[PDB]
Design a binder for this molecule. Structure first.
Ligand SMILES: CCNS(=O)(=O)OC[C@H]1O[C@@H](n2cnc3c(N)ncnc32)[C@H](O)[C@@H]1O
Ligand SMILES: CCNS(=O)(=O)OC[C@H]1O[C@@H](n2cnc3c(N)ncnc32)[C@H](O)[C@@H]1O
Lengths: 114, 114
C-alpha cells in the first residue's frame, strides 16, 4: 500500500511528516520546501502516479483532496484565500510520482502561476 | 442556471467561448488571456462561487473537473505535462466568482506557482 515514492513512506509512516489531517482516504502535511507562509500538500493514500493516470472512478477521491484542502486551509486560518495546484509530468514540474495537491496561502499569489 | 458571472453567460451561451468540451456537468474552453501556449478552463455548470463554498457532495463534480482537464489536455496534445490551478479569494487571485480549473501547458511551468 502507498506505493514506492517519498510519499509512500510518509503514508506508511516509515518517515514522519507534519501531518495536519488524516482520514481513510487521504493525508495532508506541510511542504518541506514552502513557497508561501502556508504551503501544505494533500495526497490520496491510494497510489495514483499522476493526474494523467487517474481513472473515471477516481473522481470522488480527487474532489475529496480539494475538500480536505479547503478544510485544512480553514483550520490554518487562510481567510484571504489560497491557491491549489496539481503538477503533471515534466512541464508541470512534477518530481514525485504520486498525485498530490499543493495548497498555498498566507501571501498574495502572483500571475502567471509559474 | 449558471449563475450571474462572466462564466454564467458563457454557460447559457449568451456570449460564445472557444468551447473544447461539454457534458451535462461541465464545460471547457480556452482562456481569453493565456499564460502559456495551451491554457484553458474547466468549469462546472452548477454555480459554486468558489472552492471554499463547495460542499462535501460536490466532491465527484470537482474531481470530474480534473478528469475532463486531463482528457482535454490529452486532446490538445500535451504529452510533456501540464499544471492545474484553482484560485480562491483575494490571495488566490480569483476575480471571477464561479469555480474554475485552469490547465496550463505547452511550456515548462516554473516554481513557485506564483
Ligand atoms: C513542486 C515541485 N514538484 S511536485 O509537484 O512533484 O511537488 C512535490 C512536493 O513534495 C515535496 N516533498 C518531498 N519530500 C517531502 C517531505 N518529506 N515532506 C513534505 N514535502 C515533501 C517538495 O517540497 C515538493 O514541494
Ligand atoms: C487567474 C485570474 N483570476 S481567476 O482565477 O479568477 O481566473 C479567471 C480566468 O477567466 C478569464 N476570463 C474572463 N472572461 C473570459 C472569457 N470570455 N473566456 C475565457 N476566459 C475568460 C481570465 O482570462 C482568467 O484567466
Amino acid at each position: 500500500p502507498g506505493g514506492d515514492t517519498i510519499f509512500g513512506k510518509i503514508i506508511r509512516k516509515e518517515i514522519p511528516a507534519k501531518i495536519i489531517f488524516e482520514d481513510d482516504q487521504c493525508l495532508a502535511f506541510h511542504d518541506i520546501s514552502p513557497q508561501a507562509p502556508t504551503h501544505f500538500l494533500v495526497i490520496p493514500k491510494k497510489h495514483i502516479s499522476q493526474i494523467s493516470a487517474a481513472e473515471d472512478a477516481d473522481e470522488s477521491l480527487l474532489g475529496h483532496l480539494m475538500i480536505v484542502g479547503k478544510k485544512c486551509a480553514a483550520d490554518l486560518g487562510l481567510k484571504k484565500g489560497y491557491r491549489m495546484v496539481v503538477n503533471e509530468g515534466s512541464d508541470g514540474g512534477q518530481s514525485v510520482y504520486h498525485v498530490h495537491l499543493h495548497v498555498l496561502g498566507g501571501r498574495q499569489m502572483n500571475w502567471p502561476p509559474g
